[model samples]
Target: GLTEEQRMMIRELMDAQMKTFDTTFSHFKNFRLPGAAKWSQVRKDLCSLKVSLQLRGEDGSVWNYKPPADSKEIFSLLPHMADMSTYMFKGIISFAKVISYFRDLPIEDQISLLKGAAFELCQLRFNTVFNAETGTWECGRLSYCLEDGGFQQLLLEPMLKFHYMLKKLQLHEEEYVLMQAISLFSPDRPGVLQHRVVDQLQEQFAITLKSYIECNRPQPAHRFLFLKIMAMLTELRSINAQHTQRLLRIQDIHPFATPLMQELFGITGS
Candidate 1:
């Protein structure tokens, strides 16, 4: 806990540092691929996307995922529960690390924040790979495009439903970033130890975002932009919940659960 005077200094410094953290990326402008890009490339450039995702062994342990290590198959769209969990778990840890304070907090709170937010972040990144006009997620090492990638149509059924809708909006980069931050600082997340402090951080992000929206798009007709963007979050939250349930179905086929997923979601009834 910060002392009274120290708290003020801490807040000021963190706010400034946050601006640096917040502003480093180029305006994503909801960037989508005009040319076909691969999932590996998506992970490379986005940095918040997937890799190190493991799959089940025949028994009770997990194994390093290597099936399509050099193919056109979208590893993310693989038919396993825990494959996607790696994507969710890894990215949000790094995202929270952007705030050193959040990183150093009680480890449980850090997990709580990731629990609330990580998948929603992935959904936005999902849009970047989608092209509504073409019905393709990307060209790949194995498959030239969506049609070439060999998978169940079910693999993309939900992705299509979400990213297509997200793509149509052509949302701003800041809006996506804002929601990602908001979800991370979710004070309402279950089991959060210092939720009051988390709420304060959420407010700082919300306050800056409000100022940015008002100042940059000062027109009555555009008044609802903020609301509309928030509505996207609502949609995303629903998607997150539905997908968590989807994990269960996939888990039967999967031999072992992701260890991080187990700890994060308390999967063994922890």
Candidate 2:
């Protein structure tokens, strides 16, 4: 358990680290993988990519909607997905590194915190691709993958649904980071070993968010900011749960199961 003074120290420490974390994410702000850019070639209407269809019927007849070779479309997106996952992995590890004494926490406590925090952290890491103003991912540019015959509509639609839900909140970039940080510091995670320290740290995040809103938003209407953000987190949890199920549904389709994906979403159960 952190003493009152120790809690104060964690607050200051995290505040310092978060600023640097934002700067680190700037590299990804405009970073684009070749696959993502190529995807735009067929990003028809920037919202829908139902380009064409290829089909085979039991009558031994074939239909070809020849958008592009699967290699150029779906497989191209694979590299992009891999790169993003790797980038997210590094970014989160950097956050853990920035906490000066994070490694000093009992191993079990560290694992508990990470298990609970991983997806929220990744959500923050990849947020730039989403725009709240339009409430679409890359303005439906990325959804081009959905156009491919290779994509399972059942697996992909929930992710888009989640994005629509997430982009509902018009958040400043700073608020995005703050919301993500608050999620990461959860001390009451299911297997947490150090409840006192966890709770103290979580409280600091709440205080930090409150203070941040006071200084920046400074409106009486902002009084519910913390409570509202907490509710939003609950929704994100549901999205991730569905996300994991979708990934599981695809594991049998080996072509869709890239190593980066299994590590990013599969292994984490996120």
Candidate 3:
């Protein structure tokens, strides 16, 4: 007999796998892009596998177990789990040297460079994933494994597009303020103080994000936009604080315009 902990772990793993496949299928359907071959077949295969696993016998007895009565809660939990897979592509390129270059600059210059760099990186990532071939983006295949590249592309490409679109649609000053705050406290550093500041910055952004979600904006991409913003906010939190601080200091001394500076650092008084 399996231990209780072991059983629970297995159940959770199954639930996670089920959720990922379901979400991936839904995402592709919603996007409705052309030239996506093999995804349909891939989905069918996964569904069959899921059914087999779920209906399998344990020790020659029917597994016969079901998720809790509150299975609806499982859907909610999936997003949190799926988010772990979202940042996968970020690890592909080394950003350390780029971060260091900005760190050595004046504060004003630093902000300008970061603003451009962030947007460009977002765009680049979006294009890379969006334009990938069919087998290249599918979840499982000998030709193209989703875990290594396909899955990362599918999961993050849409998010990158969403983030880029949101930035293009809204020219908010608060967004830049948030970015500055990120720079001040981001984890791009090597010390305790950096960690403390980054934590504080994240707390502030979290409060602001809650407000945005509550506004009930009547837009087609409202939910996606909100998620993209939250993703950027999360990225800021995870960044290196020392590096961010160094970049900010560079921005402060550079000959950047006052309005730009204000945009980068001005927060609403509430």
Candidate 4:
């Protein structure tokens, strides 16, 4: 736990850091290399991506829909989800492009990180619109109910459990963005070539996330909050591994229509 002075110091440090970055990157405000952009700008870009990609926007707005009557009906929604996911993959890549650390990495490392982290990041985004109590996902006008065939039985329970666990945290925007950053910089991803640099980057974000949590919610009740969030990241990895395996098996019978989907899921071009 951070002392009162320590918390205030960290908070001030973060504020000053962002203020300096705003000036440093001011020259190429419209277009700049990723190496020149600041973490603050990355956070802003991520928030915009979240807002732009999310389907439900209007405050207090409601979307009504019927559940799928059969497996065929549920399968019909797969293509739409595939399209939406492709768009999201593009959005995440764009967000990555604005990060100085990410762009500075070797090209192979860049691809490796994106390939490994995409699904985990998507799962994080999905939690925002997922209704755990109702077991439905609200996307624009379409709703995916719990009974939908779109969810594989093997992964559904774990996915829902992870969603419920994350929802329990009641995280703020900064925390969410920071978590995604941490996940993306993971050095353990199989094909990453710059392990040390990726590890250091992830460590930096983890520290930032911890400081932010301590400075904002300094209550004893919130003790172990950081550890709990890290636990969720571990669970995300487990879920992602299962999802990849499921996609691999499914490719033989029901291949994804979108090329991006096929590529991201590790499905070979047929």
Candidate 5:
């Protein structure tokens, strides 16, 4: 799926991100030893880079925030969820803006990509802090469970399984970021004007991800690992759709969602 030119572009993008990582994350630089292994060191650096850039660091302000106490309290916290969603929306939007191809795309195309994949990307970000063993997402000092989100059985079960499956893969930062890039560049998204360009960009990231997996995990047990990860993308789409449906239904009850949340979800009217 990747040409030599595309491969070089991917490398350049990774290198450019690394340059910013050096200046912004000087603390982790001291952790590297002079004789550290090449690939391993890159993996470690990428790990910290993803955590610093993607994860919500020091979200202690939310420590005092309370999750919905039960299903009935779900409406009480709807606005809180909207705020969190909007925060995550900004994170991925900024992350996408940094990508050269994404930035160069037509403004309409960029908006379409952001609108199509916003929830999925946020869910993936959430996956980083998700503790499948305890069925909770541990963010800062707060831990949110399925009930806290008021997720009904339909969306909750498959979403739970998706998290468990992803947690089992134990993805590294390189893989996670690549997937996010790939998802954002999807050409099939509705309202994309430059489908061909978007397709090539997504293909390049997919190739980069597959090659990374082969190089880092050549064990027999890790066979088809790339396919497994790709499948999760489809699962995320399903979850995204179902979640939107749930929100659509919930909107019928009251105007609890924020303007940003409604805008992101394309939720209009009561």
Candidate 6:
């Protein structure tokens, strides 16, 4: 637990970092081209940086500002809340990588970078919880609680929509292929190469979501299963060349990407 002074310092530090991040992000938004590959990396880096800053303290452990003990009534809902946090954390990290890639590109290529980064962030944000109240899905937020409605349309759906837009706009073949691979599985409407692959993933995501709700219902698990699912999704991302290439490019160039990834993955031993 953090003392009042420590907590205040943490808040102040995070606020400063967030301001810096938002400023940097604004630059990318305005200077960088829309729908650029690198832009996706920039957004990811920005979000991840913010999340990382919030989760750290000068003395290692995140400053623990517990909700009131009476809030333990709410805290009893900790597992569910934690589940949402875990998924949101993964989305944030992935987006950070996208942002980092964008920042590395030359001024001429910055727009493309920005577009790519934005697309990726849009995918992440759309897949995760966007609203706590309406339970609507958008980019950036958590939605694991039944209160928020268990699912907010799988990420694949939004990614598919993005793919369509990319095609409509005439993105490169490689980019198009990459997006196709990502939106490869549509459980609701399966056919050809999409059938088996999507079916398996659909079952997996469904079971995980179902089990999470069931476990949290009467007796919440000590830990969140959503973290595991997010981890799996993260790992799955690595198998794709475009995904790996994009991440590598970001890591090579983005000042923020490396640190953000480290922070999100807890690589700093904090």
What are the RMSDs of all candidates, in order? 12.2, 11.4, 23.2, 12.2, 13.0, 20.9
Every candidate's lDDT: 0.55, 0.54, 0.34, 0.64, 0.66, 0.33
Ranked by lDDT, top first: 5, 4, 1, 2, 3, 6
Q: Which residue window of length 10 is worst by lDDT in model 1?
A: 26-35
Which regions in candidate 5 have their CA more than 4 angstroms from the true location? 1-72, 146-156, 268-270
lDDT of 3 by residue, 1-270 (tens): 434643343343233323322222223212111113444333322221111011222255432222222212222222321222232212211231233322444554444434323433323233233323332322211112122234344344433334344445352433333333333334443322334444554465544544434453556756565566656655534432332343344333332223332343332222
**In candidate 3, residue 33 scores what lDDT?**
11
User: Model 6, 136-203: lDDT tens per residue?
Assistant: 33221211211211233322333333323232332222222223223322233212333444456435
Each candidate structure's TM-score, on Cα atoms with residue i matched to residue i, is: 0.59, 0.59, 0.26, 0.70, 0.73, 0.21
Per-residue lDDT of candidate 2, residues 187-234 (tens digit): 767778788876776776667666666666757766677677777777
Give the distance in Å from residue 151's predicted Cα in candidate 3 to where it truly belongs: 23
Clashing pairs in 4: none
* Deviation of model 3 at 106, angstroms: 18
Q: Count the backbone clashes (under 3 Å) in each candidate.
A: 3, 1, 18, 0, 0, 30
Off by over 4 Å in 3: 1-171, 192-194, 216-220, 233-270
Tens-place lDDT digits, model 5, residues 37-88: 5434333222211111122335433323333222233344455556656666
- With a 3 Å backbone cut-off (N, CA, C), the pairs that clash in candidate 5 are none
| Alpha-carbon lDDT of model 2 | 0.54
Output the TM-score of candidate 2.
Answer: 0.59
Best by TM-score: 5
In model 3, the Cα lDDT at residue 158 comes to 38
